[PDB]
Design an enzyme around this catalytic site. Structure first.
Site, short mmCIF file in Angstrom:
data_model
loop_
_atom_site.label_atom_id
_atom_site.label_comp_id
_atom_site.label_asym_id
_atom_site.label_seq_id
_atom_site.Cartn_x
_atom_site.Cartn_y
_atom_site.Cartn_z
N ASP A 210 0.74 -1.08 -0.09
CA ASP A 210 -0.04 -0.01 0.01
C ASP A 210 0.76 1.19 0.11
O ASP A 210 0.91 2.23 1.01
CB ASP A 210 -0.91 -0.06 1.23
N1 LIG Z 1 -10.78 0.55 1.35
C1 LIG Z 1 -9.50 0.51 2.15
C2 LIG Z 1 -8.43 1.37 1.31
O1 LIG Z 1 -8.77 2.72 1.02
C3 LIG Z 1 -7.84 3.52 0.06
O2 LIG Z 1 -7.51 2.83 -0.83
C4 LIG Z 1 -8.20 3.04 -1.90
C5 LIG Z 1 -7.81 4.39 -2.70
O3 LIG Z 1 -7.73 5.26 -1.83
C6 LIG Z 1 -8.78 4.52 -3.90
O4 LIG Z 1 -8.30 5.83 -4.59
C7 LIG Z 1 -8.64 7.07 -4.28
O5 LIG Z 1 -7.82 7.68 -3.48
C8 LIG Z 1 -6.47 8.01 -4.10
C9 LIG Z 1 -5.36 8.51 -3.05
O6 LIG Z 1 -5.23 7.61 -1.85
C10 LIG Z 1 -6.64 9.05 -5.30
O7 LIG Z 1 -5.47 9.19 -5.88
C11 LIG Z 1 -7.46 8.21 -6.32
N2 LIG Z 1 -7.68 9.13 -7.35
C12 LIG Z 1 -8.79 7.98 -5.55
O8 LIG Z 1 -9.70 7.22 -6.36
C13 LIG Z 1 -8.66 3.49 -5.11
N3 LIG Z 1 -9.49 3.77 -6.02
C14 LIG Z 1 -9.10 2.06 -4.10
C15 LIG Z 1 -8.01 2.01 -3.00
N4 LIG Z 1 -8.76 0.54 -2.29
C16 LIG Z 1 -6.52 3.61 1.06
O9 LIG Z 1 -5.45 4.44 0.40
C17 LIG Z 1 -6.23 2.16 1.64
O10 LIG Z 1 -4.98 2.48 2.48
C18 LIG Z 1 -7.33 1.37 2.51
O11 LIG Z 1 -6.96 0.19 2.84
#
Ligand SMILES: NC[C@H]1O[C@H](O[C@H]2[C@H](O)[C@@H](O[C@H]3O[C@H](CO)[C@@H](O)[C@H](N)[C@H]3O)[C@H](N)C[C@@H]2N)[C@H](O)[C@@H](O)[C@@H]1O
Ligand SMILES: CC(C)(C)n1nc(-c2cccc3ccccc23)c2c(N)ncnc21
Ligand code: NA
EC number: 2.7.1.95
Length: 254
Positions: free
Chosen positions: A181
């Site tokens: 991550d």
């Molecule tokens: N469900 C739990 C998870 O949630 C986030 O993960 C998600 C991302 O955040 C998403 O993306 C969004 O946020 C980004 C910045 O992080 C942006 O750049 C992007 N354009 C956005 O669409 C991506 N689509 C899916 C991913 N699973 C956390 O980071 C992760 O640690 C945690 O476990």
């Protein structure tokens, strides 16, 4: 005793962090450092246990929080670690927008270090066969956050993300030790320097694009130049778009 380690601290609860664990910040104790306490109940106990052993392993190779105490009972896991001082890469980027190139350069160097650990050292499997099965189960259990997909897949049924993702396969993995991550929220900057990473529960052997994809996605919030710079400084001149897309799609499930 956990009690002995927690005495005299003020308590706060942070809605933040990789798993659905409850995260406590322990602070305000004279002559004592700030600490974090993760508590996982039920299924989440396993996630917290996973992080503990990965922290225990990876600390020989990379700067991470130090484990102070860990407890596992059948339904609960408690993980107490030192706080790495500073702010997230995301925070520092917003605070010093002029320092974007320097921040990405530091991130590439750090990622290069992680990816240089000989995989013969690593007892953890995070490969695509393993993660795909994890994803399938999360989808089937109803745990996928369909509201949090990237813009390319906004409004897509989770089933469509799953089906489309399989059209990219297969490719031969370029396996390295990965964080799992590697986002801007999980790299910590202090006084200008990237001094540690956090949230290492998904650490294991996987394709290098597992880390490259997630960071590249984060940087897309700021600048196409910064995204390109990440690959350039990391040492890749022609990004593998298929592997990039695959790993972005896989992260939708977590
Ligand atoms: N469900 C739990 C998870 O949630 C986030 O993960 C998600 C991302 O955040 C998403 O993306 C969004 O946020 C980004 C910045 O992080 C942006 O750049 C992007 N354009 C956005 O669409 C991506 N689509 C899916 C991913 N699973 C956390 O980071 C992760 O640690 C945690 O476990
Ligand atoms: C427990 C967990 C993995 C979630 N974590 N979290 C951080 C963290 C760092 C920087 C700013 C924050 C702001 C609000 C909440 C947490 C943090 C952090 C840290 N510095 N050091 C160790 N663990 C940290
Ligand atoms: Na659901």
């Amino acid at each position: 005793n956990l009690d002995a380690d927690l005495y005299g601290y003020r308590w706060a609860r942070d809605n933040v962090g990789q798993s659905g664990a409850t995260i406590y910040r322990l602070y305000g104790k004279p002559n004592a450092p700030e600490l974090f306490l993760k508590h996982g109940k039920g299924s989440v106990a396993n996630d917290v246990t996973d992080e503990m052993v990965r922290l225990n392993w990876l600390t020989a190779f990379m700067p991470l929080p130090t484990i102070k105490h860990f407890i596992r009972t059948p339904d609960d896991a408690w993980l107490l670690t030192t706080a790495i001082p500073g702010k997230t890469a995301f925070q520092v980027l917003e605070e010093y927008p002029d320092s974007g190139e320097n921040i990405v350069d530091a991130l590439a160097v750090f990622l290069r270090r992680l990816h240089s650990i000989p995989v013969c050292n690593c007892p953890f499997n995070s490969d695509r066969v393993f993660r795909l099965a994890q994803a399938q189960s999360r989808m089937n259990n109803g745990l996928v956050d369909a509201s949090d997909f990237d813009d390319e897949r906004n409004g897509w049924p989770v089933e469509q993300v799953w089906k489309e993702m399989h059209k990219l396969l297969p490719f031969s993995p370029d396996s390295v030790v990965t964080h799992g991550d590697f986002s801007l929220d999980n790299l910590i900057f202090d006084e200008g320097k990237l001094i540690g990473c956090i949230d290492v529960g998904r650490v294991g052997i996987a394709d290098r694009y597992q880390d490259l994809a997630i960071l590249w996605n984060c940087l897309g919030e700021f600048s196409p130049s910064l995204q390109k710079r990440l690959f350039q400084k990391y040492g890749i001149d022609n990004p593998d778009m298929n592997k990039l897309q695959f790993h972005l799609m896989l992260d939708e499930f977590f």
